């Protein structure tokens, strides 16, 4: 699999702290440690397979796959965020969310991965900053460690999967996704104008509704963003 640039995923059909994170284990929507390889200078963890890849990776439609539906994406995202809840229940950050690390099985349940970086709670401050620049909320870049920051990133997936577009691209503008809350804010552009074309099914009121949660999650103000059981709220609330 296309990995980002740390610990390789190589494809019973498998894929090959991290390890204290499963201790914990039994969850729909999180990604299933088989086992693992320590007996060696190489470190492997082996984990159930994930069919469908991605959520980056079938928001691009790599490799020639169908769009995701609405219908589709709306699950997702409940499920995404059922995923992050039990880690927060559990008193855990994920400090890496991302299109990249919530994975697809073979029904296209969301299950968030790559515990790597994971922290227990059980605010704290480090001088070895992590996580995806283009999904990072302010506080997460300057050192700061706070479930907070996993709300504001998935705030950021909300928006890859209601318009389609990566975090990230420099040959665009805003060449950072999060942007786009501002240019609708200041009532330029209006989020219908941002909704991946890629879909027959994505109605506005809905549409509109997972915003809602995004631009909630995308708050600055570490303070002001919604809990993660309140995300599940308004989301499950969403369809209904």
Same mark, same amino acid.
């Not at 990604?31 to 397979?49: A, H, I, R």
């Not at 965020?81 to 039990?86: C, P, R, S, V």
């Not at 073979?106 to 790559?114: G, H, Q, R």
């Not at 099914?201 to 999650?217: I, K, L, P």
């Given at each position: ?100 690390? #919530?994975?697809?099985? +073979? ?6 991965? &790559?515990?790597?970086?994971?922290? %227990?709670?059980? !605010? ?59 240019? #609708?804010?200041?009532? +330029? ?6 909704? &991946?074309?890629?879909?027959?099914? %994505?109605?506005? !009121? ?35």
């Amino acid at each position: 699999m296309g990995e980002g640039g740390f610990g390789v995923v190589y494809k019973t059909t498998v894929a090959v702290q991290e390890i204290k994170v499963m201790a914990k284990c039994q969850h729909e929507n999180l990604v299933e440690l088989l086992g693992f390889s320590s007996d060696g200078d190489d470190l492997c963890l082996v984990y159930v397979y994930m069919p469908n890849g991605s959520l980056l990776d079938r928001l691009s439609c790599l490799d020639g796959t169908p769009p995701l539906s609405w219908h589709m994406r709306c699950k997702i995202a409940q499920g995404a965020a059922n995923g992050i809840n039990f880690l927060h229940e559990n008193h855990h950050i994920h400090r890496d969310i991302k299109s990249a690390n #919530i994975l697809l099985d +073979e029904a296209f349940t969301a299950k968030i991965s &790559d515990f790597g970086l994971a922290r %227990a709670s059980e !605010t704290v401050m480090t001088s070895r900053i992590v996580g995806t620049t283009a999904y990072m909320a302010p506080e997460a870049l300057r050192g700061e460690i706070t479930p907070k920051s996993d709300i504001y990133s998935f705030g950021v997936v909300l928006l890859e999967i209601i318009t389609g577009l990566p975090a990230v691209d420099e040959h665009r503008e805003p060449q950072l996704l999060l942007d786009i809350k501002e240019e #609708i804010e200041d009532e +330029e552009k209006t989020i219908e104008d941002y909704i &991946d074309k890629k879909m027959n099914d %994505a109605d506005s !009121t809905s549409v509109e509704a997972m915003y809602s949660v995004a631009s909630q999650c995308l708050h600055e103000k570490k303070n002001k963003r919604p809990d993660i059981k309140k995300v599940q709220q308004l989301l499950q609330e969403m369809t209904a």
